[model samples]
Target: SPRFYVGHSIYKGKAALTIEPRAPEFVALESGAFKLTKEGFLLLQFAPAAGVRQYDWSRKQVFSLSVTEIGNLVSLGPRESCEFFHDPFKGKGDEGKVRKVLKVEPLPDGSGRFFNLSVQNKLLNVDESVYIPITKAEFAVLISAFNFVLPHLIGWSAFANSIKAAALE
Candidate 1:
């Protein structure tokens, strides 16, 4: 099937996430570009960005997300946001470490919101501010996309439903 373009933003930093599937597919031989398209497709490139071959879809790599995969990228609101967690250790000490322990409230200017993103150890070390952009009319589509996938990404149905339901309220 054919696809369309969604949105593209240049990454100002490096990342460790892998988006594309492996060598069983045709374009899996090399590292390529990562992109999101209008038709809900993701053009994914991988690690070691040297001389990798490119086919039309595989060129710079074409990636896509099922409802399951897209949920990771979609932004969560306060209701849904609080439910996200991370598990970084082998021991059972830090189980259920909430990722969005910080809150995001409206800015004084009514411009948008301010939020924090952090990586923490037991002693609590790293913290950084994240800028929340003003929501645009165009964002509705992306939110709808997230809504479609919300159930699959969340482990608990009631918790997932609360997030979607909160959006309506």
Candidate 2:
């Protein structure tokens, strides 16, 4: 016989690949705020209808992101913010094992902040400096992270000025 890899699955005439013989929605994201269950996976969360609220899918660096979700550009509106997440796979290997804890902490000081941060099961600390006031220069750097990295991650340019205003506000 021959070996065949059928990642492409048909769902209601749509394309869905199995994470490990399962579909995308079947794979859960436990990287950030959301959680996954046999019921379904949490893709994104929107506080309000405004600004980019969901995390876009991408393995590439957020450096080239243009709008809100792609790169490092940050615009998270008053409450609108992208939550990067990852869910453990059930009945799968280490990569698919169930995730015990999924959390994301953005440092107040903005240290070690990146568009697409590293993936770890441990919860990262928000730099204490985040509590300290940011200088004009520091704030500018924050703005850059907002502009480039964020939009790239979300893969959308819908929300821009909101974060710009938040940066300067």
Candidate 3:
């Protein structure tokens, strides 16, 4: 017989920030923060809802956001909405072949906001969109995550610049 331990575990380190909906649904919208290991480029991973059918689960897609892009999201006012676009194959010889859009806006009653993400890929023959509705509390947490990471990213960038300058000398 083998003994199995399933209990609470504590992880201590530079943990990644993430956001998820309160209730599960057919499609799921999830996001997380990470940095490119080599270049240390801070980015946000936006995984939009995609599971339309059972088979469609394999078709899930994720998009990346730059610091500036995340700032755009952070700047949204209570009644303001912003849309960001990304061309996955912009300079990969398959330019203009696909498009990804993320739209964030407040809900009808202004209680919270909705993250609407859509993708249109001609080469892959895929076109779909999904949205995640979050309450004001969740939205605040999202904003706080961004605020907490932005400074760390900038600090690292400054340090990297110093290293580059030293190497040039």
Candidate 4:
């Protein structure tokens, strides 16, 4: 006899064939993908919006956010802005001095919002940044994606701790 599986559920026997099981599926946002890693890391990469002359769509800006940080982003209001600063190479050698800042705020025209991401490498004395705009509908999708992944991120964090503890034995 043959067995059929529906959705993501399948039968498990001596050797089970799973299709797209336990893989991290990215939620589409703009021209990029929003991914939540098993280690509870959130990654967002997207091309700059039109009218943003600093860069072109061929290039992309990648940012990592924490669970708390994403929650703050989800709660962002039209009149409010959120900024995060960190050393991308912290604990590394000389490159540890480099710093990066990500700021998200509504556009001046009040038509939409955008992300102003910049990186400052004190070692080489260089500064660079880019702006990516998000429309009202896009913003809603972003919020929904974040909200949907929040619980999964928390669950993965707990699972990571459990695995770590088990490894200690």
Model 4, CA-based lDDT: 0.61
Candidate 3: Cα lDDT at 126: 82
Reference-based lDDT, each prediction: 0.36, 0.30, 0.58, 0.61
Q: How well does candidate 1 score on lDDT at residue 99? A: 31
* Model 4 C-alpha lDDT per residue in residues 40-110, reported as the tens digit of each score: 54655444444523324355555677778888989988789999987767777755677778788988877
After superposing candidate 1 on the true structure, give the runs of residues whose Cα lies further than 4 Å from its correct spot: 1-87, 90-102, 109-115, 122-124, 134-139, 151-169
Q: Clashes in model 1: which pairs?
A: 5-37, 5-38, 6-37, 6-38, 33-60, 42-63, 43-63
TM-scores, one per candidate: 0.31, 0.22, 0.61, 0.60
Judging by lDDT against the true structure, name the best candidate: 4
Error of 2 at 142 (Å): 2.9
Q: After superposition, how far is residue 129 of candidate 4 from its true place, in Å?
A: 0.7
**TM-score ranking, best first:** 3, 4, 1, 2
| Local error of candidate 3 at residue 30 (angstroms) | 41
The alpha-carbon RMSD values of the candidates against the true structure, listed in the order shown, are 15.0, 19.4, 13.2, 14.9
lDDT of 1 at 107: 46
Candidate numbers sorted by lDDT from highest down: 4, 3, 1, 2
Error of model 4, residue 57, in angstroms:
8.1
Evaluate model 1: give its TM-score.
0.31
